[PDB]
Amino acid sequence: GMRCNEKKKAIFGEDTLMEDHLQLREKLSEDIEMIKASLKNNLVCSTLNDNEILTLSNYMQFFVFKGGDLVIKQGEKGSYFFIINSGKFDVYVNDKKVKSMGKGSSFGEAALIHNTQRSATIMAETDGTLWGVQRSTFRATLKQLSNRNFNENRSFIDSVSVFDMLTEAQKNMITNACVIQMFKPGETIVKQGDYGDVLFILKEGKATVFINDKEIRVLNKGSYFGERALLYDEPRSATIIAKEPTACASICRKLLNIVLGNLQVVLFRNIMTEALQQSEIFRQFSAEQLNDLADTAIVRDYPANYHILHKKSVKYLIVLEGKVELFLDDESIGILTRGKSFGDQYVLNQKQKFRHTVKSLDVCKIALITESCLADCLGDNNIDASIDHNNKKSIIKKMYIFRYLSEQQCNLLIEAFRTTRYEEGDYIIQEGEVGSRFYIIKNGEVEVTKNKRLRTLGKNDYFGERALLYDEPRTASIISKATSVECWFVDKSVFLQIIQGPMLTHLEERIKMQDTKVEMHELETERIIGRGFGTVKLVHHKPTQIRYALKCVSKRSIISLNQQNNIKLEREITAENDHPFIIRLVRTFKDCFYFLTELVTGGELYDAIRKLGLLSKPQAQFYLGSIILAIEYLHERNIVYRDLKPENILLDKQGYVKLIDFGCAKKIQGRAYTLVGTPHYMAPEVILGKGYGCTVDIWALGVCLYEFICGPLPFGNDQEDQLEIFRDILTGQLTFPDYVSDQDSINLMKRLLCRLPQGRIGCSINGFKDIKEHAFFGNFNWDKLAGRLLEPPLVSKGETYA
């Protein structure tokens, strides 16, 4: 009997105590009504409907205690929330008796929001029992309720035909406008003849339809009605009455108009945008431009066999319904069905005579875009020139170098483009030579080469942009690899006449820092500039003499709080950020993790506002405006920041802002539920645990504006206890001091600090447009902000760090 000659591995606070007291107990009517009563008064649960509270009530657990047994200690980490069922319980703060609690009373309120160290000890005087629930269970139950409600409502949005032409984002936005409405047997949901404006969808139960007091049919779960009442003012065709207990998801037109705008206008824009984008011309148009074409297009119904067009200043034609046949003279050239379109030729050549014929094959609906309709869309009568102008604008607005310049700067630059032609085999650029030109390929193809082939570029690609910022050797060659290639080009001399010093300095310094492929051994630490988490060192790169910042995240710090999956997700977000008002990552290192970023030398915004005192309107516009662009950028990439506060905003050498610290930031996929952020800045929806998204940063924006204009924080300014901060956030009164003289500032603050996201400015389908166009910003040039053409509020004299 031989043995195994290997080896075999071995195996190895408040929740432990409540386990000793837990017992099974069937809940009666009297128990449920007590729970229901107690939760209706609770900070988080007061807004919840009966079915939500009844669900939460069921997850409560029975805990039996003897007189003298410990329930809660003072200084231990909190977790349970309690409702006293029987007996008496005494509260001893600092080993000193204060209150005596009995049947109906509650304690451990804060535990339902976050892990908090308790204040006092609760002891049991007589033999008594508690109804209890943990945080985990409570937050999980609130998550599941709201999340399933949302998913169920969205499926019903999908089953309703009138919403078919809404986008993903539009459907998700109106899913939140769904209100659940309960009807007992006998209750009439809608009555024949009433001008109602509400769609209804049966989740569970059945309801009977009555036209003229006569039963037509019965309606089962999934059946819906009132979709026409979201579009038009019309009487109800029927009287719908509930047969059994029924739950209805409902959408009112009033809320839809707030959230989405006019539903007919939005649907048509989507239909028209999709059609117009089939043409290569209108793909380059902006969303606004296409929306304008949709709003002003002439819509017409034609009978069959009608000459819609023959030999009229129509340039483009879209089939909304039916079929039309296209003719060149007597030759049929094709049939256009629903969604197809015609007119590329005439859109591009404004003055060209319409040579084609369009004839309806059946009864049809057609959208027509005229010459005036394009001119109004584009802002001038020279359609051919504007389309060319915009084609170029679309190309350069994708490049960092050009996309943040003012519109006036961008227009002048486009106008300065000159065209040249090349024979096949011509070196457009030769490597090693010093360039002074930026190129965009109009026609043909080119080959990028070095020392062998690297790439191939064609129509609307670009190259050589670095020559506008630097005097350096071309790292590659550009050989014309086609028949007769044409490039648009702009000279450096022209670029330098258009761009001004501050923007040029920003670009010079920013594009350079990707070139320096640094290594850890090439960095020398000058001084420390931050502490924590870890430490931030100012470092000096020996080869290039460029100065950087080096954050030092410790391994033992990250592994302690289990932030394993969060540091990798943080690196991803931080690396992808490429906006002028967001910190730019250079590279990372490991051995402790490291972030190498650009050096920001003008200190925190926390200190700047404290140097300035109360900000004037122009100063608040500048800083809040700057934060808006950074936050907008992140929201467009589905990133919620979650920790917006002045501490997390640095100022650069020129006085422009840099958003830092993306530890709390997250790539949003649906509704987020985790409680993160800094309490004073946290949005109500985060605290209430029913789901949130990018809208939280807009609340935070409001908190910042309040600090800027008013001085103190709007909620919990005096408070240190986190429970009392959240309370003031949830139910406190928003007030403004007597020295705040600006009506528009207060209006904006109130609407940014709207508790429910649906009524919050910037949280509708228009997004930040509504914030940017608010009267507070009436005299504010957003165009000049991004391009660094505004005097900032404060310019730092020398460098400044914490």
Author numbering: 0 to 5, 8 to 13, 20 to 318, 322 to 461, 463 to 543, 545A, 546 to 603, 606 to 816
Passage from the reporting paper:
We report herein the structure of cGMP-free PKG from Plasmodium parasites, the causative agents of malaria, one of the world’s deadliest infectious diseases. Here, we describe the complete atomic structure of PKG from two human malaria parasite species, P. falciparum and Plasmodium vivax. The two orthologs are 92% identical in sequence; furthermore, alignment of their structures resulted in rmsds of 0.8 Å—representing negligible differences. In the Plasmodium PKG crystal structures, each protomer in the dimers can be described as four CNBs, which, together with the N lobe of the KD, form a pentagonal arrangement, with the KD C lobe locked in the center. Interestingly, all three Plasmodium structures display a swapped domain arrangement, in which the N terminus of each protomer in the dimer interacts with the active site of the other. All three of our Plasmodium PKG structures feature an activation loop that is both in its open conformation and unphosphorylated—an uncommon combination previously observed in rho kinases and rho-associated kinases such as ROCK and MRCK. Although the domain-swapped dimer in our crystal structures suggests the intriguing possibility of an intermolecular regulatory system (in which each protomer extends N-terminal residues to block the substrate-binding site of its dimeric partner), the totality of our biochemical and biophysical data indicates cGMP-free (i.e., inactive) Plasmodium PKG to be predominantly a monomer.
Previous work has demonstrated that one particular kinase, known as cyclic guanosine-3′,5′-monophosphate (cGMP)-dependent protein kinase, or protein kinase G (PKG), has essential roles in multiple stages of the parasite life cycle. Selective pharmacological inhibition of Plasmodium falciparum PKG (PfPKG) blocks the egress of merozoites and gametes from erythrocytes, as well as inhibits the motility of ookinetes in the mosquito and invasion of hepatocytes by sporozoites. The cellular functions of parasite PKG are regulated by allosteric and cooperative binding of cGMP, similarly to how mammalian PKG is activated. In contrast, PKG enzymes of Plasmodium and other apicomplexan parasites have an extended N-terminal domain that features four CNBs upstream of the KD and are monomeric, resulting in an effective regulatory stoichiometry of 4:1.
